[PDB]
Write an enzyme that holds these catalytic residues in place. Structure first.
Site, PDB file in Angstrom:
ATOM      1  N   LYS A 156       4.281  24.153  20.178  1.00 60.10           N
ATOM      2  CA  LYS A 156       3.881  25.679  20.400  1.00 60.10           C
ATOM      3  C   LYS A 156       2.405  25.720  20.285  1.00 60.10           C
ATOM      4  O   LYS A 156       1.777  25.939  19.145  1.00 60.10           O
ATOM      5  CB  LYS A 156       4.685  26.668  19.376  1.00 60.10           C
ATOM      6  CG  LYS A 156       4.428  27.987  19.820  1.00 60.10           C
ATOM      7  CD  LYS A 156       4.505  28.944  18.509  1.00 60.10           C
ATOM      8  CE  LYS A 156       3.155  28.511  17.658  1.00 60.10           C
ATOM      9  NZ  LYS A 156       1.875  28.890  18.211  1.00 60.10           N
ATOM     10  N   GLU A 203      -3.243  21.065   7.859  1.00 67.86           N
ATOM     11  CA  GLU A 203      -4.493  20.712   8.100  1.00 67.86           C
ATOM     12  C   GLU A 203      -5.161  22.078   8.305  1.00 67.86           C
ATOM     13  O   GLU A 203      -4.882  22.558   9.428  1.00 67.86           O
ATOM     14  CB  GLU A 203      -4.905  19.801   9.226  1.00 67.86           C
ATOM     15  CG  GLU A 203      -4.057  18.247   9.292  1.00 67.86           C
ATOM     16  CD  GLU A 203      -4.210  17.343   7.830  1.00 67.86           C
ATOM     17  OE1 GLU A 203      -3.668  16.302   8.080  1.00 67.86           O
ATOM     18  OE2 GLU A 203      -4.971  17.789   6.942  1.00 67.86           O
ATOM     19  N   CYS A 251     -13.105  22.764  12.585  1.00 70.94           N
ATOM     20  CA  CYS A 251     -12.907  22.916  11.362  1.00 70.94           C
ATOM     21  C   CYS A 251     -14.028  22.010  10.613  1.00 70.94           C
ATOM     22  O   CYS A 251     -14.519  22.297   9.352  1.00 70.94           O
ATOM     23  CB  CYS A 251     -11.539  22.455  10.988  1.00 70.94           C
ATOM     24  SG  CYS A 251     -11.104  20.688  11.450  1.00 70.94           S
ATOM     25  N   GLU A 287     -14.962  30.572   5.619  1.00 69.00           N
ATOM     26  CA  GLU A 287     -15.384  29.871   6.647  1.00 69.00           C
ATOM     27  C   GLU A 287     -15.672  30.889   7.769  1.00 69.00           C
ATOM     28  O   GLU A 287     -14.847  31.819   8.345  1.00 69.00           O
ATOM     29  CB  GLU A 287     -14.105  29.235   6.970  1.00 69.00           C
ATOM     30  CG  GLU A 287     -14.113  28.701   8.463  1.00 69.00           C
ATOM     31  CD  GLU A 287     -12.880  27.515   8.815  1.00 69.00           C
ATOM     32  OE1 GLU A 287     -11.786  28.185   8.546  1.00 69.00           O
ATOM     33  OE2 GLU A 287     -12.844  26.768   9.480  1.00 69.00           O
TER      34      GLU A 287
HETATM   35  N1  LIG Z   1      -7.969  19.501  10.880  1.00 70.13           N
HETATM   36  C1  LIG Z   1      -8.375  20.479  10.446  1.00 70.13           C
HETATM   37  O1  LIG Z   1      -8.226  20.771   9.006  1.00 70.13           O
HETATM   38  C2  LIG Z   1      -8.642  21.599  11.030  1.00 70.13           C
HETATM   39  C3  LIG Z   1      -8.871  21.242  12.685  1.00 70.13           C
HETATM   40  C4  LIG Z   1      -9.105  22.195  13.555  1.00 70.13           C
HETATM   41  C5  LIG Z   1      -9.115  23.605  13.206  1.00 70.13           C
HETATM   42  N2  LIG Z   1      -8.708  24.038  11.899  1.00 70.13           N
HETATM   43  C6  LIG Z   1      -8.781  25.110  11.582  1.00 70.13           C
HETATM   44  O2  LIG Z   1      -8.111  26.367  12.515  1.00 70.13           O
HETATM   45  C7  LIG Z   1      -8.563  27.592  12.187  1.00 70.13           C
HETATM   46  C8  LIG Z   1      -8.949  28.117  13.845  1.00 70.13           C
HETATM   47  O3  LIG Z   1      -7.591  28.027  14.437  1.00 70.13           O
HETATM   48  P1  LIG Z   1      -6.580  29.600  14.739  1.00 70.13           P
HETATM   49  O4  LIG Z   1      -7.431  30.610  14.603  1.00 70.13           O
HETATM   50  O5  LIG Z   1      -5.780  29.180  16.102  1.00 70.13           O
HETATM   51  O6  LIG Z   1      -5.685  29.478  13.400  1.00 70.13           O
HETATM   52  P2  LIG Z   1      -4.182  30.256  13.169  1.00 70.13           P
HETATM   53  O7  LIG Z   1      -3.892  29.895  11.698  1.00 70.13           O
HETATM   54  O8  LIG Z   1      -4.599  31.660  13.287  1.00 70.13           O
HETATM   55  O9  LIG Z   1      -3.246  29.772  14.235  1.00 70.13           O
HETATM   56  C9  LIG Z   1      -2.952  28.413  14.481  1.00 70.13           C
HETATM   57  C10 LIG Z   1      -1.670  28.127  14.934  1.00 70.13           C
HETATM   58  O10 LIG Z   1      -0.955  28.664  14.012  1.00 70.13           O
HETATM   59  C11 LIG Z   1       0.170  29.743  14.937  1.00 70.13           C
HETATM   60  N3  LIG Z   1       0.801  30.803  13.939  1.00 70.13           N
HETATM   61  C12 LIG Z   1       0.332  32.089  13.462  1.00 70.13           C
HETATM   62  N4  LIG Z   1       1.001  32.727  12.836  1.00 70.13           N
HETATM   63  C13 LIG Z   1       2.185  31.783  12.833  1.00 70.13           C
HETATM   64  C14 LIG Z   1       3.313  32.254  12.039  1.00 70.13           C
HETATM   65  N5  LIG Z   1       3.563  33.256  11.364  1.00 70.13           N
HETATM   66  N6  LIG Z   1       4.425  31.061  12.359  1.00 70.13           N
HETATM   67  C15 LIG Z   1       4.112  30.077  13.066  1.00 70.13           C
HETATM   68  N7  LIG Z   1       3.095  29.668  13.425  1.00 70.13           N
HETATM   69  C16 LIG Z   1       2.078  30.626  13.599  1.00 70.13           C
HETATM   70  C17 LIG Z   1      -0.579  30.246  15.935  1.00 70.13           C
HETATM   71  O11 LIG Z   1       0.171  31.076  17.075  1.00 70.13           O
HETATM   72  C18 LIG Z   1      -1.496  29.029  16.500  1.00 70.13           C
HETATM   73  O12 LIG Z   1      -0.498  28.102  17.185  1.00 70.13           O
HETATM   74  C19 LIG Z   1      -9.774  27.449  11.612  1.00 70.13           C
HETATM   75  O13 LIG Z   1      -9.868  27.959  10.191  1.00 70.13           O
HETATM   76  C20 LIG Z   1      -9.958  26.089  11.403  1.00 70.13           C
HETATM   77  O14 LIG Z   1     -10.904  25.524  10.217  1.00 70.13           O
HETATM   78  C21 LIG Z   1      -8.446  23.046  10.948  1.00 70.13           C
END
Ligand SMILES: NC(=O)c1ccc[n+]([C@@H]2O[C@H](COP(=O)([O-])OP(=O)(O)OC[C@H]3O[C@@H](n4cnc5c(N)ncnc54)[C@H](O)[C@@H]3O)[C@@H](O)[C@H]2O)c1
Ligand SMILES: NC(=O)c1ccc[n+]([C@@H]2O[C@H](COP(=O)([O-])OP(=O)(O)OC[C@H]3O[C@@H](n4cnc5c(N)ncnc54)[C@H](O)[C@@H]3O)[C@@H](O)[C@H]2O)c1
Lengths: 474, 476
Positions: free
Chosen positions: A170, A243, A280, A374
């Site tokens: 997803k 993550e 990230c 962040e």
């Molecule tokens: N490996 C790592 O540690 C790593 C790598 C890249 C990004 N990140 C983190 O990702 C973040 C940015 O990504 P984003 O804005 O897409 O984050 P997000 O947490 O808003 O969403 C990420 C994913 O989660 C899904 N999601 C949101 N609400 C949900 C729910 N209630 N149930 C199930 N799924 C849900 C979203 O649709 C999306 O697919 C930054 O904080 C970044 O640091 C971490």
């Protein structure tokens, strides 16, 4: 307009999620507003299909996928650029990375880490041998964030194919077209279709099914801290690899020569701005020891001003937009607020919607929102820190996060001190925190993750169960 | 009656309310420990979190091997404590001291091992002349929750690898068998362990249980126990790593290629596997799946061997089989046997239960859906399920429960071994041994309802009790 790909089949709904180009704010695509039942279908298919691919077969499919990514690189980076807004330079590099992920997962297919134990070790001993083997899971659920619409999906799917798993992905509703295209590439490369679905829709409709569906043995999620802790409060009895956010430092130590400071300033500006700052492991805090700052900061400023920020589709643009204008406006506010608290903004040519310039701010207080929270954008913030390693390590460790870090220094004693002392997943000496290879262990601690490592090798291990068997051995 | 306090980082801590510990042989109080509360666990975790161990690998090894040696010197005293609160025979509790000796020996030996790795980075077009190296660091605090069936060895499996790894651990043993854990804490402090590295707290699960699962300092919960309690913990340990090792219901499979001498050997394995520790092992033989065409020859051999077991007073040296945990457990298992007989089973040997003392009941023709064999029955029942002379149908019946921990398969035909090894949905398939067979260092853990899918045993517990940190250096 693009339907879901459920095991190789195009699946649609009446309602639509619109996908907008952050440069323009125009609709460039549509995908289905998927519901729990679509995911449910995707998982029932995954659960029931038992992959038989040989290791050679898996390798052929993964290597054929790499070649397709290389052959379609401009087409794919256009799709990335049109949903995410990052420059063609950044999206073309992203395709390069996915090519490496598939290539390495392909080559990892020949590797067998089975172990063997002899049993006559104690006075209880038997004349016997124990052997280990790995087997796939029933079904994997992968949920991905917007910052690498291609590569986050590759890191979740390529290790699943390489271990004979069936995965349902997803992607985020913000950047889902890239995942759907990858699915088509995979099927055309020979992937049995029941091994991959890509479903889309609003998180309130389809999100919870990705977390609780009975067939799911493992949920692998990359995204924000709050969404991570929400998932952690709900996946009852499943393994979860979470993550979450990073807030990573580049630490400039006081032993450096002026020439070293130039090289450190090169790493600072690149670390803070690559992918519009949306990693990230981006440099989000440059911790510069007092006695070199006066020399270091003008070198950073000079390099930041060279950056060309603008139209993402222009191949000469370095910095494209951030994900949307709301995120841009928020990073600008944090800057403006750090400046009311004593920061000194040194370069800020002005925001234009989602297009943020690489703003440089010096004397950032360590406790301001900009560096304590962040800030997922191309801000280049310098925090001046004391000429004392313990105080510097203390301050570097003082946020909720702990993913990666970069330290620049030539003194080995101090390198080792930072390696041992930073509470993070990775410490890179003379590189940005973002530096890794696609197959080294990757993951953070504290709020940055629940403690499991990823990258191709660890993901492959994560995605299987070890079974042992023992045989008489007289 | 021995009254003992908790051990909080070496301090003896008492409360006024007591948990009474009863000897299942005659149901009398033999001990009391404190009815501890959330705040005792909270204090223990604050100490664990604040203490940063500095022991060298050598000093950990010394402590661990001194602990092994004190388990050996005191085996009689320790097995007495185990038998008095669990009711297993002295033969079984002496065996259990022997295993804890191996666990501590093996953990002390594993301290010299460094499994670090090195990656060269000039691998792709994005190359770099650089090496990445890995190292392991300890966690803030570990919470260990343990079951009644190995009151020493289960604590040893959680504690030894924490010590080997410079972790600090808080153990809450079961309220049914806590006295053994407290004795082991004493032995550890006396073997030289810095006391902040271990606490043992006790009390009712309603009082102190949730604190073990939810305390803010706990990085990892390691739990061994029943499916329902395991599901509760899984659901409440939000954002913690969880190693959850839950019920088993393990088959011993007898294939129709075996000769009548091989059947006698398989019968030795069935009877030992079904009854060892009074049947109280997550990997006990709990279903003997015998292919139809050898069953009439195999069953009499099982019957002959079962009748050799002396069951009685667990403190008597002539006892092979002591009691199960309590009278209520013993009554339930007998009632499942009586139900199986009403649904078609044949009870072949049943000399009578008295209180918590269950004899090694032999039942043949057990329906595979009956509660006796479908649910986990944690006693010395020896139940033979007749299965078809067809490996696909046998494998399907073996995989038909909610459990998937270990298994044993008796056969001489290689083709059939490999088919069972690949086809059984379990963590372990032992060929020609009981499901319970393992060494203390091989990866141990089940799937399905038997475990959340992480492995334990000394080596894997050592890895799961650390964080891997990577670092990279210029390498031109
Ligand atoms: N490996 C790592 O540690 C790593 C790598 C890249 C990004 N990140 C983190 O990702 C973040 C940015 O990504 P984003 O804005 O897409 O984050 P997000 O947490 O808003 O969403 C990420 C994913 O989660 C899904 N999601 C949101 N609400 C949900 C729910 N209630 N149930 C199930 N799924 C849900 C979203 O649709 C999306 O697919 C930054 O904080 C970044 O640091 C971490
Ligand atoms: N490795 C394995 O998979 C393994 C090994 C041995 C035993 N077992 C299993 O253990 C079970 C027998 O042990 P048991 O009866 O002591 O199991 P149990 O699940 O009743 O209790 C185990 C522990 O959980 C604690 N507990 C109970 N309720 C709790 C709560 N609400 N919050 C926190 N802690 C709570 C108990 O006090 C005890 O310390 C069997 O099912 C057996 O198969 C499994």
């Amino acid at each position: 307009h693009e339907p879901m790909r459920i095991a190789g089949r195009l699946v649609d709904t009446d309602d639509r999620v619109e996908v907008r180009y952050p440069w323009n704010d125009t609709v460039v695509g549509t995908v289905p507003a998927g519901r729990a039942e679509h995911a449910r279908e995707a998982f029932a298919i995954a659960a029931a299909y038992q992959p038989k691919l040989t290791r050679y077969e898996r390798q052929k499919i993964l290597l054929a996928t790499a070649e397709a990514l290389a052959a379609r690189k401009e087409e794919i980076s256009d799709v990335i650029t049109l949903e995410l807004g990052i420059s063609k330079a950044d999206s073309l590099y992203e395709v390069g990375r996915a090519f490496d992920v598939f290539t390495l997962a392909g080559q990892m297919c020949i590797r067998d880490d089975g172990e063997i134990f002899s049993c006559d070790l104690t006075p209880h001993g038997k004349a016997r041998k124990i052997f280990t083997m790995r087997e796939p899971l029933t079904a994997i659920s992968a949920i991905t964030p917007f910052n690498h619409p291609l590569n986050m999906v590759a890191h979740k799917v390529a290790p699943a194919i390489a271990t004979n798993n069936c995965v349902v992905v997803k992607p985020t509703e913000l950047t889902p077209m890239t995942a759907l295209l990858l699915a088509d590439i995979l099927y055309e490369a020979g992937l049995p279709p029941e091994m991959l679905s890509v479903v889309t829709g609003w998180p309130a409709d389809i999100g919870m099914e990705m977390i609780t569906n009975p067939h799911v043995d493992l949920v692998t999620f990359t995204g924000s801290v709050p969404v991570g802790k929400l998932i952690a409060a709900n996946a009852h009895y499943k393994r979860q690899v979470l993550e979450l956010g990073g807030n990573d430092p580049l630490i400039i130590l006081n032993d450096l020569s002026d020439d070293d400071l130039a090289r450190a300033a090169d790493l600072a500006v690149a670390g803070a701005t690559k992918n519009s700052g949306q990693r990230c492991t981006a440099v989000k805090r440059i911790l510069c020891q007092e006695s070199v700052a006066d020399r270091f900061v003008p070198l950073v400023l000079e390099r930041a001003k060279r950056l060309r920020f603008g139209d993402p589709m222009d191949r000469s643009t370095d910095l494209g937009t951030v994900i949307h204008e709301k995120a841009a406006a928020l990073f600008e506010e944090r800057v403006m607020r750090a400046a009311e608290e004593g920061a000194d903004i040194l370069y800020h040519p002005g925001r234009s919607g989602a297009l943020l310039p690489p703003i440089v701010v010096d004397r950032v207080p360590h406790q301001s929102d900009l560096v304590l929270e962040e800030t997922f954008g191309p801000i280049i913030p310098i925090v001046r820190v004391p000429d004392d390693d313990d105080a510097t390590i203390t301050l570097s460790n003082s946020t909720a996060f702990g993913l990666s870090s970069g330290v620049c220094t030539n003194d080995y004693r101090r390198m080792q001190k930072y390696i041992a002392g930073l509470k993070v997943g990775t410490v890179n000496i003379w590189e940005v925190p973002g530096y890794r290879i696609e197959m080294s262990p990757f993951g953070g601690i504290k709020d940055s993750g629940n403690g499991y490592k990823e990258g191709v090798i660890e993901a492959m291990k994560s995605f299987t169960n070890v079974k042992t068997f023992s045989l008489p051995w007289p």
